Coordinates of C-alpha atoms in Angstrom, one line a residue:
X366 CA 0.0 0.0 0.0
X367 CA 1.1 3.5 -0.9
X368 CA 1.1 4.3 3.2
X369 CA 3.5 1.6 3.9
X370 CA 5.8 2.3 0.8
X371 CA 6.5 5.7 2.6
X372 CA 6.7 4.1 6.0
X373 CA 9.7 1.9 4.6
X374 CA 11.4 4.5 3.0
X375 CA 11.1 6.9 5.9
X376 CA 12.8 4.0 8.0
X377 CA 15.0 3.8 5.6
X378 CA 15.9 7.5 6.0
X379 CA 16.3 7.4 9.5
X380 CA 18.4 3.9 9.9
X381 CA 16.6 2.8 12.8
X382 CA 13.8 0.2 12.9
X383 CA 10.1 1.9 13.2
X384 CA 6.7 0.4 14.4
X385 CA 3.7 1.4 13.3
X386 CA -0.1 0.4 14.5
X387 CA -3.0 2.5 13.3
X388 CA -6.8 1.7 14.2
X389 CA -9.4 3.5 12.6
X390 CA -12.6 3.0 14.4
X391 CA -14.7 4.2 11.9
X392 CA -14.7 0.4 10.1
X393 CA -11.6 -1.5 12.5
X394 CA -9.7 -1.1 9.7
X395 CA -5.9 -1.4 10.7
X396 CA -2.5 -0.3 9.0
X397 CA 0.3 -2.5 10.3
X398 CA 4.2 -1.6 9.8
X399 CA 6.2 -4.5 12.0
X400 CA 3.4 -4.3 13.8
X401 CA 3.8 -8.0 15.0
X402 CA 7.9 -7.3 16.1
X403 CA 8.8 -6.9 19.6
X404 CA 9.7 -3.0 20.9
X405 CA 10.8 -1.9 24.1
X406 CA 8.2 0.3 25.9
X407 CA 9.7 2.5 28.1
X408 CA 7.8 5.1 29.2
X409 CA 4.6 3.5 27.1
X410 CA 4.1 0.9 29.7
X411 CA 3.7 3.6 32.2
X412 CA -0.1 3.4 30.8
X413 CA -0.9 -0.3 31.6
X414 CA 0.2 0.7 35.1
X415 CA -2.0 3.6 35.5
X416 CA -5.2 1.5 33.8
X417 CA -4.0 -1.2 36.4
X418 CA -4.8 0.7 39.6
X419 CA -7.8 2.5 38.0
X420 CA -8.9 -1.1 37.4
X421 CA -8.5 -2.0 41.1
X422 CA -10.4 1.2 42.3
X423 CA -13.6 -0.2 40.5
X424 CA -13.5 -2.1 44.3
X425 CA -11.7 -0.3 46.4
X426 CA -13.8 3.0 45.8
X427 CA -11.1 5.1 47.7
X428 CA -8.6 3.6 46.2
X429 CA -7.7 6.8 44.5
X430 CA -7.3 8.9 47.7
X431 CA -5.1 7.1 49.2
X432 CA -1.7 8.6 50.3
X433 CA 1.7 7.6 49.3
X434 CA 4.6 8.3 50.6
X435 CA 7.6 9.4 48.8
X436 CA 10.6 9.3 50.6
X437 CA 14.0 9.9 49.2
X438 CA 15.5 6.6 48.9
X439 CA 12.2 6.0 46.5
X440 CA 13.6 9.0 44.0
X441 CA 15.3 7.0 40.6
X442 CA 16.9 8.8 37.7
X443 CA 13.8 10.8 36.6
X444 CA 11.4 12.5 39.3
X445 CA 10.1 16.0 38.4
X446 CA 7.1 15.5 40.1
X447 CA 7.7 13.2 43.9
X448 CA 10.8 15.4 43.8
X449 CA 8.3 18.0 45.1
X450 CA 6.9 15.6 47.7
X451 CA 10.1 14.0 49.5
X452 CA 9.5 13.2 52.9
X453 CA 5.5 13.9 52.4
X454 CA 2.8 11.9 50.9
X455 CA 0.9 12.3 47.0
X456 CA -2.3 10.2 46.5
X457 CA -2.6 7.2 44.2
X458 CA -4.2 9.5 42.0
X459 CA -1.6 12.3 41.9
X460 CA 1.0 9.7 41.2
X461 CA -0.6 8.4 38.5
X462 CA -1.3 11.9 36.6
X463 CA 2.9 11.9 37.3
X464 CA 3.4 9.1 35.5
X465 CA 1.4 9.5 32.5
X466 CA 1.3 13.6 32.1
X467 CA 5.1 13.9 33.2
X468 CA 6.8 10.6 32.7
X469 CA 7.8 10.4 36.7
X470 CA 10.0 7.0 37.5
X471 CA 9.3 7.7 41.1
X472 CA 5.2 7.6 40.8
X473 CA 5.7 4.7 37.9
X474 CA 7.4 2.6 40.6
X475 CA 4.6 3.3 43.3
X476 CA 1.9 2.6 40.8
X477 CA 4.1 -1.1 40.4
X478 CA 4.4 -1.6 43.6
X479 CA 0.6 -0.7 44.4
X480 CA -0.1 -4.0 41.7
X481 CA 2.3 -6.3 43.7
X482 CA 5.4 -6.4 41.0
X483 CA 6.5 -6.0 37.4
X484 CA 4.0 -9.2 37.4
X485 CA 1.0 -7.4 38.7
X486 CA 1.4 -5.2 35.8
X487 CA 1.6 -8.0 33.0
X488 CA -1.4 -9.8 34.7
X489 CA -3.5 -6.8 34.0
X490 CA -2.9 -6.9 30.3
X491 CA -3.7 -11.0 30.6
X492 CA -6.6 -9.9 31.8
X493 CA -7.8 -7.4 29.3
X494 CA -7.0 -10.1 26.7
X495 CA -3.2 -8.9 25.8
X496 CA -1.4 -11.5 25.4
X497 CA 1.9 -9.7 24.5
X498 CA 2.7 -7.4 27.0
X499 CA 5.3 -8.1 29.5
X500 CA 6.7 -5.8 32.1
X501 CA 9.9 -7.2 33.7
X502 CA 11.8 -4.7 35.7
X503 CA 11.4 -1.2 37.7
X504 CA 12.3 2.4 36.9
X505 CA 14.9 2.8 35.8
X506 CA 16.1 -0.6 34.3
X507 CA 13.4 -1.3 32.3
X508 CA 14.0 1.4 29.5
X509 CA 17.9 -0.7 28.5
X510 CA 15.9 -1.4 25.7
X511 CA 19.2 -3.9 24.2
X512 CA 18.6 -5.3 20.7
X513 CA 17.1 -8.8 21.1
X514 CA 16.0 -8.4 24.6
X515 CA 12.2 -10.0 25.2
X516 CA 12.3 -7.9 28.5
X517 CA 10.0 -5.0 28.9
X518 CA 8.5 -5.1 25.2
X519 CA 5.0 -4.9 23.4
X520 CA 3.8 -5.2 19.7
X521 CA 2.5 -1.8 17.8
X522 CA -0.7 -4.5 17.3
X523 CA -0.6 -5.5 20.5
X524 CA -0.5 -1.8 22.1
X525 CA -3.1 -0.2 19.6
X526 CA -5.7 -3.1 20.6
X527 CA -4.9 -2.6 24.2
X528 CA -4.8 1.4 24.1
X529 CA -8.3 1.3 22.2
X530 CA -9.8 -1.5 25.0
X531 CA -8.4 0.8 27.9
X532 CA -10.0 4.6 26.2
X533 CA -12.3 4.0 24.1
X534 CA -13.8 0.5 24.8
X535 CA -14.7 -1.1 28.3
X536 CA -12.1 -2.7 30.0
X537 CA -12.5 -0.2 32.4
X538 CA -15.6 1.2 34.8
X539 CA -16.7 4.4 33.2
X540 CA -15.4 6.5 35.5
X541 CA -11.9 4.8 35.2
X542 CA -12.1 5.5 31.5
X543 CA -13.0 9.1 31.4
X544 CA -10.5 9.3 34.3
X545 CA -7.6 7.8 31.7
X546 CA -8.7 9.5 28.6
X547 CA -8.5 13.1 30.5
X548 CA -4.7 12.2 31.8
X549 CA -4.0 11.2 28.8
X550 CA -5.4 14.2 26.8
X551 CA -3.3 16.3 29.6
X552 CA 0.2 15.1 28.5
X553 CA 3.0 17.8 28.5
X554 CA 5.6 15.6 26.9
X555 CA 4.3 15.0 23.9
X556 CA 4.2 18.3 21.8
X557 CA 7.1 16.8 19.2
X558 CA 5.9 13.1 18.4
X559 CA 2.7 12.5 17.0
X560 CA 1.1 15.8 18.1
X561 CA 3.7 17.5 15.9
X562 CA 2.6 15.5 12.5
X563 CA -1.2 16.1 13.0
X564 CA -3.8 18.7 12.4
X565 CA -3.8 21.4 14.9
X566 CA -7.3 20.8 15.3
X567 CA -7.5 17.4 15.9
X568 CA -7.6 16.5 19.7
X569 CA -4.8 13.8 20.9
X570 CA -4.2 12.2 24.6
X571 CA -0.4 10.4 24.3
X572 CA 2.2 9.1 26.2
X573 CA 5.8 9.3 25.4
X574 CA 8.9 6.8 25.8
X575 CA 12.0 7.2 24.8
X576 CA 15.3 4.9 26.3
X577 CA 18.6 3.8 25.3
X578 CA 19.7 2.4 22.2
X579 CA 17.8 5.9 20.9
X580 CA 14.4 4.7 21.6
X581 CA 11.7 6.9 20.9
X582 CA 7.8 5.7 21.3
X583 CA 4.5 7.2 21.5
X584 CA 0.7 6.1 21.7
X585 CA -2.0 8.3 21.2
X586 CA -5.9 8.6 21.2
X587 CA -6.4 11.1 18.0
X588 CA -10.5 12.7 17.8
X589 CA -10.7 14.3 14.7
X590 CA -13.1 17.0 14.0
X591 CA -16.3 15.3 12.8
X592 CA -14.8 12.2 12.3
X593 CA -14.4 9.1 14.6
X594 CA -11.5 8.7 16.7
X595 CA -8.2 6.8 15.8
X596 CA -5.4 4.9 17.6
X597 CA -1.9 5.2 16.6
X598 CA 1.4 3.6 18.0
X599 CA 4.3 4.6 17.1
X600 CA 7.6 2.9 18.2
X601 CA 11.4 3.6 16.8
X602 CA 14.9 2.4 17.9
X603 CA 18.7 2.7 16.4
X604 CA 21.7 0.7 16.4
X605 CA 23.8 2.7 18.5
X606 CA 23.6 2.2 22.6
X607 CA 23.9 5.8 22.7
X608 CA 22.1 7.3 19.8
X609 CA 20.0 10.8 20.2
X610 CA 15.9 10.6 20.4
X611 CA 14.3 11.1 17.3
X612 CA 11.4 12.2 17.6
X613 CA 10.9 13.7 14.3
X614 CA 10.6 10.2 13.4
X615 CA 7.4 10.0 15.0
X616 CA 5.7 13.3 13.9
X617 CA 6.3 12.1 10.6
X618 CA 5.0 8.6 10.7
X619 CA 2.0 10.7 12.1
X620 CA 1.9 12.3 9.0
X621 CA 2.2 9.6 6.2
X622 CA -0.7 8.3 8.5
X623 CA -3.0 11.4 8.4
X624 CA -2.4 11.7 4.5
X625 CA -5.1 8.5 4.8

């Protein structure tokens, strides 16, 4: 297809290997590019974390309110947001906006430990009917993202059927989801991946990875105007253990897509 011809030779501009997943669910109609190769997540699986513990508060109504505290042998590589909180408490739900809106490491470890383990995490997405998923290791480890490595790694399919379930289907309680959807839409890290390849106009709630080996990754909820919504995965990583971000990549993956 004319979409995936420019996907390959974008990839081949950029000599890394790039992942795309696109569901339009206007007809389910999908557009795959490796979309069945592994990827390391990084800071994507900081979602499946979040939609974990808004899964558990379907129960345990105050689950949400609950406080956490952050003290500073929790603080990892990465903590703009429990750096502001050492030696006090933030809420299940403030540590979760943390992880998804600012990419905190500190809150993503709570929200793991909350679930019980890396394996908490993965039996979430076993639950939700993702078989592919796997979360391994903590913040910071879990973003080494070395060539080969099965650790810490999705699918695009795999993450664009999960990311739909979790926002715009009902894996969750309603409350959960709108609760997700507005975190989500409330990103601030996100204004040069996919954001930067779309219409100004169109509305998009992401989250950002990026690692080493130059990994760069984002996942994104895209309403157009008058138009139903789309998914969209994006994943990209280099050859080089120490290779810059790229996330030009991914703004214009975004836009070979939105040219459909």
């Amino acid at each position: 297809s004319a979409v995936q011809q420019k996907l390959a030779a974008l990839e081949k501009s950029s000599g890394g290997r790039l992942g795309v997943a696109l569901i339009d669910t206007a007809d389910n109609t999908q557009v795959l590019y490796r979309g069945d190769e592994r990827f390391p997540m990084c800071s994507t699986s900081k979602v499946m974390a979040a939609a974990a513990v808004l899964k558990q508060s379907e129960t345990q109504k105050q689950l949400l309110n609950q406080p956490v505290e952050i003290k500073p042998a929790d603080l990892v590589n990465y903590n703009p947001i429990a750096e502001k909180h050492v030696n006090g408490t933030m809420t299940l739900a403030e540590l979760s906006a943390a992880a998804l809106q600012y990419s905190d490491n500190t809150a993503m470890n709570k929200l793991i430990a909350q679930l019980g383990g890396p394996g908490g995490v993965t039996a979430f997405a076993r639950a939700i009917g993702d078989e592919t998923f796997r979360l391994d290791r903590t913040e910071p480890t879990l973003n080494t993202a070395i060539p080969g490595d099965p650790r810490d790694t999705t699918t695009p399919r795999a993450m664009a059927q999960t990311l739909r379930q979790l926002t715009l289907g009902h894996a969750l309680g309603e409350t959960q989801r709108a609760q997700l959807v507005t975190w989500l839409k409330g990103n601030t890290t996100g204004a040069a991946s996919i954001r930067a390849g779309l219409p100004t106009s169109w509305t998009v709630g992401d989250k950002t990875g990026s690692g080493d080996y130059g990994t760069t990754n984002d996942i994104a909820v895209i309403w157009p105007q008058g138009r139903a919504p789309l998914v969209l995965v994006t994943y990209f990583t280099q050859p080089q253990q120490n290779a810059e971000s790229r996330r030009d990549v991914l703004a214009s993956a975004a836009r070979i897509i939105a040219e459909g």
